[PDB]
Design a protein around this ligand. Structure first.
Ligand SMILES: OC[C@H]1O[C@H](O[C@H]2O[C@H](CO)[C@@H](O[C@H]3O[C@H](CO)[C@@H](O[C@H]4O[C@H](CO)[C@@H](O[C@H]5O[C@H](CO)[C@@H](O)[C@H](O)[C@H]5O)[C@H](O)[C@H]4O)[C@H](O)[C@H]3O)[C@H](O)[C@H]2O)[C@H](O)[C@@H](O)[C@@H]1O
Length: 554
């Protein structure tokens, strides 16, 4: 819908439909006029915020507005008219070279499980050194318990998180504290419950499908309208909620053979309104991130799993699934200097040559992490890395990524040493999908906890039990990164022995000692931070026997 003067225009694209009627609940039924493209319209003057409505098809069946702005009674309920105050800055104050990102799942972040709960934690975040919070998908999904990827109304803010009013309040309060908010958005697929688009028109591609459902139709018959549906959604989040940027989910599963890729158009919209796009890419292909004059889509940055996988595989000893492609120290050094480990070499996991070198692109085109919702939650027992490595290793892992040239992303709780698992949970009502989720998560991930069980969700809620030694470590790590101008700068010299490595930057050098060993140090410097007490306040060029641990020098 779109509120005009005192009247409001209802627009519904439904080419499969002969005639649709608007059903305002406390008022009457209204016949909609049809144009040749398949668009249904009526201007109504009696409608006010916040009335409920549905659409009634040729079927006589009643469905919610697929472009709904609020879904008060969940996915199968009516839609609701909200206020459309388009207050937005023309500029985000976020500078992407200064980006430290904190990933939040609203539902489990705090006892509240709401936007109000993340608001309460803003000062804490600000004080930690974070510059931006990344919110997992908030587009309305079934029930109350879901990561967000089963979202099924792109324009509707999850009711159980606190809806539109609560999200607007979150972003306003974040700006007041000087924090940015990045929104996780899903344009590659749609959730398996509460989607009614398939009855309206060819929203989905017949060409291929994702592991999580059918993909959107971007390059085939009638795709103009669906391109518009997605592109106006990124416009909507910017103008109606004043969001600072986006994390685009699974861009490798957004397939488009058009002259201009939809991903380039997505980035075009966000840069038109001076915002930021990060992409989750499995492609290891610099085209996602390259400038337009270099045949790229010009996304600001992309997740580099290769960085995480190098660290995890090496420190845990783990080789199951995608970890089989990693495990050596070499991999960490490779990722530290060439970004991708798979830059056009053969992957045993994928059984094909994978990737492409990244060129002279600086570090702030990439985001790295040792933990996130996937690397924790797709484990059958959902164990955080804190459970798989010793204390020393954990701090070594934290130092590696936070002191890297790339944009670092902290996973909620990681910073204070959270020990609670993060499980996969869902809240479907359809018995077939309740059947499929359990058996699928059992088979694919080895998950023994029931995703549909409430306890699986409750067990994933952060404890907020502060380990002060870990927290102080992160706090200083973040501080020193800013102070040492580590951001974006790929000019690093890395040396490695069997059980250790030294990384030297322009203003610092770091010692990463994985086992007691004798190391030749080529640099002088004063101690900034350390995982131990075993490290000297002042070090000079020479040979030293170090115990397991990390040290940072100026
Ligand atoms: O191949 C090497 C890489 O492998 C991984 O990456 C892939 O999988 C990731 C995790 O699934 C993807 O990440 C993102 O995309 C998905 C989907 O949006 C999302 O996945 C989560 O949510 C879905 C949807 O609920 C869930 O799907 C299952 O359950 C539903 C409900 O029953 C069912 O319909 C599906 O059939 C089930 O499969 C997933 O289980 C859950 O993981 C994820 O959260 C997003 O971040 C990547 O895009 C994709 O490449 C690995 O993550 C990489 O690190 C490896 O490099």
């Amino acid at each position: 819908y779109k509120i005009d003067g005192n009247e409001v225009i209802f627009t519904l694209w439904a080419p499969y439909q002969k005639s649709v009627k608007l059903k305002v609940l406390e008022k009457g039924l209204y016949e909609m006029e049809r144009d040749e493209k398949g668009y249904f319209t009526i201007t109504l003057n009696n409608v006010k915020v916040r009335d409920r409505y549905k659409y009634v098809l040729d079927d006589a069946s009643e469905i919610p507005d697929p472009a709904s702005r609020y879904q008060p009674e969940g996915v199968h309920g009516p839609s609701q008219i909200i206020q459309e105050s388009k207050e937005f800055n023309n500029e985000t104050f976020l500078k992407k070279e200064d980006l430290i990102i904190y990933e939040i799942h609203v539902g489990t972040f705090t006892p509240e499980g709401t936007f109000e709960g993340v608001i309460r934690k803003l000062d804490y975040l600000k004080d930690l050194g974070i510059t931006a919070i990344e919110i997992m998908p908030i587009a309305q999904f079934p029930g109350k318990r879901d990561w967000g990827y089963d979202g099924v109304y792109l324009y509707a803010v999850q009711n159980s998180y606190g809806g539109p009013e609560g999200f607007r309040k979150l972003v306003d309060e974040a700006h007041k504290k000087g924090l940015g908010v990045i929104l996780d958005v899903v344009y590659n697929h749609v959730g398996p419950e509460g989607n009614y688009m398939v009855k309206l028109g060819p929203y989905f591609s017949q060409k291929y499908k994702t592991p999580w459902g059918l993909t959107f139709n971007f390059d085939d018959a009638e795709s103009d309208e669906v391109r518009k549906f997605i592109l106006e959604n990124v416009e909507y989040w910017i103008k109606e909620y004043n969001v600072d940027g986006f994390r685009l989910d699974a861009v490798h599963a957004i397939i488009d053979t058009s002259p201009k890729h939809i991903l380039e158009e997505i980035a075009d919209v966000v840069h038109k309104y001076n915002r930021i796009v990060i992409a989750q890419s499995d492609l290891n292909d610099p085209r996602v991130v390259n400038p337009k004059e270099k045949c790229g889509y010009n996304i600001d940055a992309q997740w580099v799993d290769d960085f995480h996988h190098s660290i995890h595989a090496y420190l845990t000893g783990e080789r199951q699934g995608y970890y089989t492609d990693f495990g050596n120290l070499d991999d960490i050094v490779k990722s530290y200097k060439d970004v991708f480990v798979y830059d056009g070499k053969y992957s045993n996991f994928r059984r094909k040559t994978h990737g492409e070198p990244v060129g002279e692109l600086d570090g702030c085109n990439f985001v790295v992490y040792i933990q996130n919702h996937d690397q924790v939650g797709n484990r059958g027992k959902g164990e955080r890395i804190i459970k798989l490595v010793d204390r020393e290793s954990y701090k070594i892992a934290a130092a590696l990524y936070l002191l890297s040239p790339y944009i670092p992303m902290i996973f909620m709780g990681e910073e204070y040493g959270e020990e609670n698992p993060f499980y996969f949970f869902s809240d479907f009502s359809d018995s077939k999908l309740i059947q499929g989720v359990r058996e699928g998560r059992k088979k694919e991930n080895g998950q023994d906890t029931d995703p549909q069980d409430e306890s699986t969700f409750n067990a994933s809620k952060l404890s907020w039990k502060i380990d002060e030694e870990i927290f102080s470590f992160y706090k200083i790590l973040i501080k020193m990164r800013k102070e040492l101008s580590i951001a974006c700068d790929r000019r690093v010299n890395v040396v490695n022995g069997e059980n250790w490595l030294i990384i030297k930057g322009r203003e610092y050098f770091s010692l990463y000692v994985f086992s007691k060993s004798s190391i030749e140090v080529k640099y002088s410097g004063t101690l900034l931070l350390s995982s131990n007490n075993s490290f000297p306040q002042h070090i000079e060029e020479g040979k030293y026997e170090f115990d397991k641990g990390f040290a940072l020098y100026k």
